[PDB]
Write a protein that binds this ligand. Structure first.
Ligand SMILES: CCCCCCCCCCCCCCCCCC(=O)OC[C@H](COP(=O)([O-])OCC(O)COP(=O)([O-])OC[C@@H](COC(=O)CCCCCCCCCCCCCCCCC)OC(=O)CCCCCCCCCCCCCCCCC)OC(=O)CCCCCCCCCCCCCCCCC
Ligand SMILES: CCCCCCCCCCCCCCCCCC(=O)OC[C@H](COP(=O)([O-])OCC(O)COP(=O)([O-])OC[C@@H](COC(=O)CCCCCCCCCCCCCCCCC)OC(=O)CCCCCCCCCCCCCCCCC)OC(=O)CCCCCCCCCCCCCCCCC
Ligand SMILES: CCCCCCCCCCCCCCCCCC(=O)OC[C@H](COP(=O)([O-])OCC(O)COP(=O)([O-])OC[C@@H](COC(=O)CCCCCCCCCCCCCCCCC)OC(=O)CCCCCCCCCCCCCCCCC)OC(=O)CCCCCCCCCCCCCCCCC
Ligand SMILES: COC1=C(OC)C(=O)C(C/C=C(\C)CC/C=C(/C)CC/C=C(\C)CC/C=C(/C)CC/C=C(\C)CC/C=C(\C)CC/C=C(\C)CC/C=C(/C)CC/C=C(\C)CCC=C(C)C)=C(C)C1=O
Ligand SMILES: CCCCCCCCCCCCCCCCCC(=O)OC[C@H](COP(=O)([O-])OCC[N+](C)(C)C)OC(=O)CCCCCCCCCCCCCCCCC
Ligand SMILES: CCCCCCCCCCCCCCCCCC(=O)OC[C@H](COP(=O)([O-])OCC[N+](C)(C)C)OC(=O)CCCCCCCCCCCCCCCCC
Ligand SMILES: CCCCCCCCCCCCCCCCCC(=O)OC[C@H](COP(=O)([O-])OCC[N+](C)(C)C)OC(=O)CCCCCCCCCCCCCCCCC
Ligand SMILES: CCCCCCCCCCCCCCCCCC(=O)OC[C@H](COP(=O)([O-])OCC[N+](C)(C)C)OC(=O)CCCCCCCCCCCCCCCCC
Ligand SMILES: CCCCCCCCCCCCCCCCCC(=O)OC[C@H](COP(=O)(O)OCCN)OC(=O)CCCCCCCCCCCCCCCCC
Lengths: 116, 61, 77, 70, 62, 198, 175, 230, 300
């Protein structure tokens, strides 16, 4: 159910993270549980860099990449506050009236060039 | 260099060759190939072409 | 110079190549008479000091024409 | 640049071409390769690599890093 | 062709060529209308659920 | 609790301007307002009890295949874990390629060049405007053409093969029940695909 | 080709004849050579008489680039919103956690493991666990920014939950 | 002097044919898919309807200049023609006509018209004012002389592609040396003063109006050799 | 863990990038132009390191190294043909004498200068993705970065056009001696076949390696090995899921680049027979761009 959970709802231990050689950038984020099966499948499915750079479904690594992509979307949205920022950009007056996030709304200036 | 001399479309090696080679190469394959192949294929189906379905395939989980 | 267009009203360059033809050019915003260029009230110095006989005559003719027209309008007030 | 004469006594490398350079290349490449092979073996005796994919270090194994017992 | 993000940023988003499944033509009658209404409601609810999941799953990772 | 469909309709009404509306120009806003009137009504509750089902015996085999293709499309719309990547690609509209995109932008360039020529020479008349309208209409029609050719020629045999694979594994009666508007969409969400290794 | 050129002339390396006394006050101020001796430092911008005149000219002409940088900054300042940048808030026990953990454990001032009556403070390079300067300002700013982003996400979640509850109340109340 | 004939494997001129698309060379042969060959081989272009369509569309022969002498229609009944621009005036008018469609189109079709204006302001002030616009403002599209007023009618181009005619007294005209206006307007003469005669610059001193004449413009000998203009 | 680094890397990097790019935009010597371009790109590398993302540093380093090396080889062939005269004030019309040099230099300059739709554009965009805004001297830093990023167009265009497609500013001996009818042969070349093959293979391998690095780092599936760094910021969030304000800012930068391209292409610094027709071409290009935008966005 949760975005950070993988297909099998299995949490990976520190020894498993070390053995599977998870990059530190992924390790800092919360998507290790969904990244590890994707890397395991890619190790089991060695493809050229062109295949990764061109295939949109990632070929054989379809379900694992779907879970990892959902987790990545949520992770990079929360690290960015991009949902709140886009909500305030779409309608700055309505967002302030509704009080989506007063902390962000109290210091938000859209800019003159962007429809004032 | 290789200053080729070749009467195109009026020569035996050219358009007449293109018109002549397929009609003669495909003589035996078309006069003894088709009849022999048809006989060999249809001699089996004296009663039918049906595939006796072993391994079921009529069963579903 | 034009697609699906006929140029019947267009003036021919053959016509333009002849000197002395009777074509008149009517252009937008064409002020062809300086009837109002040199009329100014509350002059700091003499109109003769700042303007010559040509400009003064232009202004005087414009004022005379306007005054005569207004006096003509006075007959139905 | 236009070629100019070089003194015969001077051991300089200006416009020097050896007509037998192929055998010299052979006998300067192959023994160098052998020497580097020997040095490579010697240095490969002392070489460290991290564990491969799917391999973890047991913390209680002798391979694991150790701390001084005072 | 493959990374048009420069055009998206510099000239905005253009009108994409029409892509549609034309798969609803299989069924005919009022059933088609009911299924089309159901699918439109599902698409709107799916967009709303995506928005709500983005705004709710913030504290899931702890 | 409350009806989920009505709750989601109310939340859509409350939050539509947050995610479904982006910045638009004046003409963009005009087009958006025009299309809003022409847009389909989002009805929370749809009366599916007014429909009467027809049994499979009425439909022929080809019609059953078409209806189970629609059933698979419905399942893919509702349950996103049902189909594999290749099955989804078979069941999804085919992405348009360089032929279609270059065709569209060549049409746009031709239109822009013609309009530039008309403006620079002030060649604006009834015939010219009719030519522009006919050209843009034909271009729109023949840009709709590649999608139709793609869909039919490529996808339709693949979709029918997929349906025949699914018919022999699930059941024509199962798919006929699925295509029925009274079918529980909540139950359809939790349906497990027997033809998916997961 | 087309002419039998003689060998390269000896004039290609003209012999330099010293016409001036090599002053000891100019020692190594010249690259000495029998062909083309040079001054040790080349001044291609000699149209500036001094280095002070050169500084004046540089600061006079750099004012244009100061103005252009000001224009660019103003354009990007009245048309762009500051971004949500900082350390990854999903990993606060890492780079930020280790800094405060080191400043909290104070393991560098412990007693000697042999009882030598010397601690870490008895060195030219000694620990200072009550310093409060340097990179600590940046660490505090990063921690504050991470907390601010977490608060924004929490406020967004509270807002969406409140909206859902309000919608449920509105639909249920009417009946 | 070429010695490619002495050798067999040496490259021929026929091999240097792919360079014709990149190197200008007199024609040697017509290819199968050349445009001329396509037009002269496909019979649909031999039909009368295509010939009639071509013969009645595109540029008309009436607009083609038929002589090296032209007498533009008189601006006034008594005026006589002196000078007229030829192509620079047309290009200037077509460029300033962009403000009549693109500028309103920018307002009605750009998502951020304020952004468009904020980028256009420095473009105008730093690059385009001294390039086209200020030269257009000082550009003399047409010059005639009204003798009864002893004045000159100068027709110029205005903001949205407009045309407007102003009258200037002949006695108030003065010659402005380029060196006199060299340093104070160097940018304009650097990027936007090539199509006008920088050695033939005049000024109405009453209003400080600058008269620039196109280098490709046509002058009438009769009008120029007039006692009013000396 | 250094406050001195946090303060000195972005400021010095941005100042260096601005200075190098600006001076390279004014250099008449080819080698000096490329040296100041190298100075600018080293400043940009310092800035990229100050952003906290090491992958961007690696990508920028690889792209700059490959394309700067290729451009150096091309300008070296040009200098050898010009007989050790490096200034392009004595060049022009070298496209015919150096065709391969012209085309390869075009490719390597459009990649090196970070023109849009190129790998240099990608690395500069990544640099602006991770630039931190918490610096006290951010105004100066950001202004210098913008002015140094827009400076690639100027020096790339000046070098290419002046070397190859300007007027014949060179000396008559350079042109006439290489154009004698006797020299016409299948072996004719003002460069070396080995030089041409080396530059071609260098460009091909550079493209392959840069694409491999982009797939290893910039893909959705991050497949790069550990960089042994525990300082992880959120700069990848704006690369993956950016907001609208950042997109509009990078749009501002892109339109600045577009205006500079318009300036360099259409500005007439000298009298020409095509001066009027150049202005006509600019006008019709503006109108065509407007109508193309109208049709491609609304009509169809
Ligand atoms: C904060 C800003 C506060 C306001 C500052 C003043 C603003 C208004 C300046 C208008 C322009 C004045 C001028 O002479 O411009 C010519 C100057 C270049 O002169 P030039 O004719 O090219 O060359 C003159 C020769 O070099 C020969 O030079 P010279 O012998 O004529 O001596 C003048 C020269 C040298 O100045 C002096 O000798 C004066 C004494 C300086 C002592 C040290 C002061 C520290 O100074 C300049 O040329 C520029 C002076 C800039 C002053 C502001 C610096 C900050 O152009 C500009 O300065 C353009 C404007 C640039 C922006 C100015 C403000 C800087 C900050 C902008 C962002 C905020
Ligand atoms: C007043 C009148 C108003 C109305 C005017 C209406 C007429 C059109 C006006 C605008 C025409 C225009 O812009 O032409 C530009 C330009 C015309 O170039 P050009 O200077 O006339 O010379 C044409 C070349 O010689 C063509 O090269 P080639 O003759 O040496 O043969 C090579 C040609 C054709 O390819 C071959 O010949 C290879 C196959 C050989 C064996 C065939 C059996 O390949 C190409 O052209 C390659 C480009 C892509 C073609 C399409 C794929 O148009 C093209 O190049 C487009 C393709 C032209 C036809 C060739 C392909 C047919 C398929
Ligand atoms: C405050 C009171 C104190 C005086 C302020 C004077 C003033 O407004 O100066 C600004 C100044 C007025 O021009 P100026 O050169 O100082 O005075 C000579 C007149 O403009 C000479 O007039 P013109 O016949 O050259 O007209 C040029 C045209 C302005 O037309 C343009 O600048 C063309 C822009 C490009 C259009 C084509 C696409 C590329 O001006 C107008 O149409 C006036 C309305 C305002 C500008 C147009 C609307 C902008 C939104 O504004 C501009 O030049 C605007 C340039 C950027 C437009 C975007
Ligand atoms: C064009 O360069 C230059 C070179 O080439 C690199 C040179 O070789 C040389 C030659 C130098 C030498 C021979 C030796 C000298 C050594 C040096 C290192 C000199 C280097 C000089 C510079 C790099 C130029 C710096 C000069 C100026 C005037 C800075 C230019 C930037 C601006 C004018 C932008 C104006 C910024 C404003 C108005 C900020 C206002 C504040 C806000 C809007 C608040 C925003 C809120 C925040 C939280 C942000 C915080 C911002 C703050 C605190 C502002 C602080 C920043 C500042 C810049 C003051 C010179 C003179 C030069 O000149
Ligand atoms: C007043 C004006 C009057 C005239 C107005 C204009 C009238 C029409 C003028 C011609 C334009 C025709 C447009 C419709 C074309 C429809 C094509 C179609 O059905 O595509 C289905 C699709 C288009 O594919 P696609 O590119 O959209 O994507 C397919 C899906 N993916 C990406 C997954 C692969 O398939 C094909 O076209 C099949 C490909 C093989 C076609 C073989 C025939 C020869 C053509 C080869 C391609 C083009 C080569 C030449 C390119 C140009 C060179 C100069
Ligand atoms: C002078 C001759 C006139 C007549 C002939 C004209 C021929 C065509 C001339 C084209 C000139 C270059 C314009 C851009 C070409 C883009 C090519 C392409 O395939 O783009 C599709 C791609 C497709 O990307 P996309 O934006 O549709 O979205 C991604 C879609 N996928 C992932 C499926 C590819 O790029 C674009 O559509 C970019 C946006 C439009 C860019 C052009 C308009 C910009 C604004 C006008 C001013 C410039
Ligand atoms: C209140 C005032 C309202 C009116 C202000 C009008 C200001 C602009 C006047 C000049 C307009 C003509 C130039 C742009 C023509 C359209 C180009 C286009 O497709 O833009 C898409 C976009 C439209 O997209 P958009 O504005 O809807 O949103 C996406 C774009 N961003 C995110 C960047 C805002 O047009 C612009 O961004 C316009 C920028 C104009 C900047 C000034 C240009 C000066 C130089 C003129 C020559 C330009 C030649 C062509 C350059 C582009 C093509 C290579
Ligand atoms: C052929 C030579 C092409 C040389 C120019 C390439 C320009 C595009 C570089 C893209 C770099 C980023 C990247 O790896 O994107 C991954 C993407 C696909 O992976 P993705 O779509 O999962 O990642 C994109 C991630 N965002 C949206 C955040 C940027 O690849 C492409 O877009 C295609 C790039 C060209 C591939 C050519 C292969 C041969
Ligand atoms: C602290 C010490 C730092 C030493 C390293 C930095 C030296 C900076 C100054 C360099 C310098 O003045 O170089 C001048 C000269 C070569 O310069 P140049 O004549 O331009 O040669 C290029 C070809 N024409 O090169 C030299 O004169 C080299 C010797 C420099 C001696 C130290 C000068 C320190 C000045 C402070």
């Amino acid at each position: 159910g949760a975005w950070n959970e993988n297909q099998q709802h299995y949490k990976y231990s520190k020894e498993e993270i070390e053995a599977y050689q998870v990059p530190m950038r992924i390790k800092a984020g919360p998507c290790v549980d969904t990244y590890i099966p994707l890397k395991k499948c890619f190790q089991e499915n060695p493809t050229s860099f062109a295949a990764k750079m061109l295939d949109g479904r990632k070929g054989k690594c379809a379900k694992e990449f779907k879970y990892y992509n959902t987790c990545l979307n949520h992770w990079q949205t929360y690290e960015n506050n991009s949902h709140v920022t886009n909500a305030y950009w779409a309608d700055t007056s309505k967002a302030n009236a509704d009080g989506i996030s007063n902390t962000y709304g109290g210091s938000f200036r859209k800019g003159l060039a962007w429809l004032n | 260099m290789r200053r080729i001399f070749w009467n195109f479309k009026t020569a035996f090696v050219g358009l007449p060759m293109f018109s002549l080679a397929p009609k003669n190469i495909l003589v035996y394959p078309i006069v003894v190939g088709v009849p022999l192949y048809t006989f060999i294929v249809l001699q089996n189906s004296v009663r039918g072409f049906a595939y006796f379905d072993e391994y079921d395939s009529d069963v579903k989980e | 110079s034009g697609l699906l267009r006929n140029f019947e009203k267009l003036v021919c360059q053959s016509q333009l190549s002849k000197a002395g033809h009777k074509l008149l050019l009517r252009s937008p915003n064409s002020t062809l008479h300086p009837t109002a260029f040199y009329y100014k009230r509350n002059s700091s110095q003499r109109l003769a000091n700042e303007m010559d006989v040509f400009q003064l005559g232009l202004a005087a003719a414009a004022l005379t024409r306007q005054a005569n027209n207004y006096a003509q309008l006075l007959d139905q007030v | 640049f236009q070629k100019y004469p070089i003194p015969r006594y001077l051991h300089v490398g200006q416009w020097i071409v050896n007509k037998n350079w192929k055998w010299n290349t052979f006998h300067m490449f192959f023994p160098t390769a052998i020497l580097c092979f020997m040095v490579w073996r010697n240095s490969m005796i002392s070489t460290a690599k991290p564990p491969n994919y799917g391999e973890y270090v047991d913390p209680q194994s002798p391979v694991a890093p150790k701390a001084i017992k005072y | 062709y493959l990374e048009p993000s420069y055009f998206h940023e510099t000239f905005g988003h253009m009108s994409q060529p029409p892509k549609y499944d034309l798969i609803d033509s299989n069924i005919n009658g009022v059933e088609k209308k009911l299924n089309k209404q159901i699918l439109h409601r599902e698409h709107n609810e799916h967009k709303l659920d995506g928005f709500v999941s983005m705004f709710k799953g913030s504290d899931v990772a702890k | 609790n409350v009806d989920q469909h009505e709750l989601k309709a109310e939340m859509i009404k409350e939050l539509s301007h947050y995610y479904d509306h982006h910045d638009l120009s004046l003409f963009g806003k005009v087009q958006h307002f025009v299309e809003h009137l022409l847009e389909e009504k989002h009805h929370a509750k749809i009366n599916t009890s007014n429909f009467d089902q027809k049994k499979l015996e009425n439909f022929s085999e080809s019609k059953q295949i078409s209806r189970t293709v629609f059933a698979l499309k419905k399942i893919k719309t509702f349950n996103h874990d049902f189909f594999t990547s290749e099955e989804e690609m078979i069941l999804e509209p085919l992405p348009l390629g360089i032929l279609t995109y270059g065709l569209k932008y060549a049409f746009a360039g031709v239109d822009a060049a013609l309009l530039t020529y008309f403006w620079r020479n002030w060649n604006f008349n009834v015939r010219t405007i009719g030519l522009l309208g006919g050209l843009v209409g034909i271009q729109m029609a023949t840009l709709h053409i590649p999608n139709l050719v793609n869909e039919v020629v490529i996808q339709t045999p693949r979709r029918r093969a997929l349906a025949k694979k699914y018919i022999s594994a699930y059941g024509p009666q199962f798919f006929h029940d699925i295509v029925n508007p009274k079918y529980d969409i909540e139950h359809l969400r939790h349906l497990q695909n027997k033809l998916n290794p997961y | 080709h087309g002419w039998d050129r003689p060998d390269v002339p000896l004039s290609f390396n003209p012999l330099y004849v010293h016409k001036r006394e090599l002053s000891i006050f100019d020692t190594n101020m010249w690259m000495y050579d029998q062909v083309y001796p040079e001054y040790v430092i080349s001044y291609n911008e000699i149209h500036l008489v001094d280095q002070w005149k050169g500084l004046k000219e540089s600061f006079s002409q750099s004012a244009y680039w100061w103005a252009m940088m000001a224009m660019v900054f103003g354009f990007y300042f009245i048309n762009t919103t500051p971004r949500q940048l900082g350390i990854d808030t999903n990993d606060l026990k890492g780079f930020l956690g280790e800094y405060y953990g080191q400043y909290k454990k104070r393991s560098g001032i412990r007693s000697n493991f042999l009882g030598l009556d010397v601690t870490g403070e008895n060195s030219i390079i000694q620990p200072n666990y009550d310093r409060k300067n340097g990179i600590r300002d940046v660490i505090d700013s990063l921690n504050a920014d991470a907390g601010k982003r977490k608060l924004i996400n929490l406020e967004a979640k509270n807002f969406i939950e409140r909206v859902e509850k309000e919608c449920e109340q509105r639909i249920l109340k009417k009946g | 002097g070429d010695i490619r004939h002495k050798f067999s494997n040496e490259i021929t001129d026929d091999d240097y044919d792919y360079q014709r698309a990149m190197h200008v060379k007199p024609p040697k042969e017509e290819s199968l898919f050349q445009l001329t060959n396509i037009l002269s081989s496909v019979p649909v272009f031999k039909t009368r309807f295509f010939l009639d369509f071509i013969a009645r569309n595109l540029d008309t022969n009436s607009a083609v200049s038929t002589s090296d002498f032209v007498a533009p229609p008189r601006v006034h009944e008594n005026s006589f023609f002196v000078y007229h621009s030829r192509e620079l005036g047309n290009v200037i008018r077509k460029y300033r006509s962009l403000e009549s469609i693109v500028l309103p189109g920018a307002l009605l079709t750009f998502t951020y018209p304020l952004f468009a204006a904020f980028v256009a302001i420095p473009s105008y002030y730093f690059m385009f004012n001294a390039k086209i616009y200020e030269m257009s403002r000082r550009f003399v599209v047409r010059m005639d002389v009204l003798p009864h007023l002893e004045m000159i009618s100068v027709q110029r181009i205005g903001a949205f592609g407009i045309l407007y005619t102003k009258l200037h007294r002949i006695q108030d005209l003065e010659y402005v040396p380029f060196d006199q206006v060299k340093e104070q307007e160097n940018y304009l003469w650097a990027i936007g003063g090539h199509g006008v005669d920088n050695q033939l610059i005049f000024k109405d001193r009453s209003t400080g109006e600058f008269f620039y004449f196109e280098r490709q413009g046509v002058w009438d000998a009769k009008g120029l050799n007039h006692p009013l203009l000396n | 863990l250094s406050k001195y680094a946090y303060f000195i890397l972005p400021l010095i990097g941005s100042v260096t990038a601005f200075y190098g790019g600006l001076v390279s935009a004014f250099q008449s010597d080819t080698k000096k132009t490329l040296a100041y371009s190298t100075i600018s790109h080293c400043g940009f590398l310092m800035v990229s390191y100050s952003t906290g993302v090491l992958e961007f540093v690696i990508l920028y380093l690889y792209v700059h190294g490959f394309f700067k090396a290729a451009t150096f080889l091309c300008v070296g062939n040009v200098n050898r043909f010009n007989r050790n005269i490096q200034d392009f004030k004595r060049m022009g019309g070298f496209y015919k004498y150096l065709p391969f040099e012209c085309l390869a230099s075009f490719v390597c300059m459009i990649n090196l200068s970070g023109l849009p739709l190129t790998l240099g554009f990608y690395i500069k965009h990544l640099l602006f993705i991770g630039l931190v805004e918490s610096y006290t001297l951010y105004p100066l830093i950001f202004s210098s970065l913008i002015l140094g990023a827009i400076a690639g167009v100027f020096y790339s265009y000046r070098l290419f056009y002046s070397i190859f497609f300007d007027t014949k500013k060179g000396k008559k001996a350079i042109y006439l001696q290489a154009s004698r009818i006797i020299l016409n042969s299948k072996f004719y070349s003002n460069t070396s076949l080995a030089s041409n093959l080396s530059i071609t293979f260098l460009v091909l391998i550079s493209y392959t390696v840069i694409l491999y690095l982009y797939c290893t780092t910039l893909n959705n599936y991050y497949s790069l090995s550990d960089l042994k760094s525990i300082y992880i910021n959120n700069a990848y969030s704006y690369f993956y899921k950016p907001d609208y304000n950042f997109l509009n800012a990078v749009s501002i930068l892109n339109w600045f680049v577009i205006i500079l391209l318009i300036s360099v292409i259409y500005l007439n610094w000298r009298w020409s027979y095509y001066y009027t027709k150049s202005i006509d071409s600019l006008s019709k290009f503006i109108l065509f761009s407007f109508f193309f935008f109208i049709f491609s966005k609304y009509i169809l």
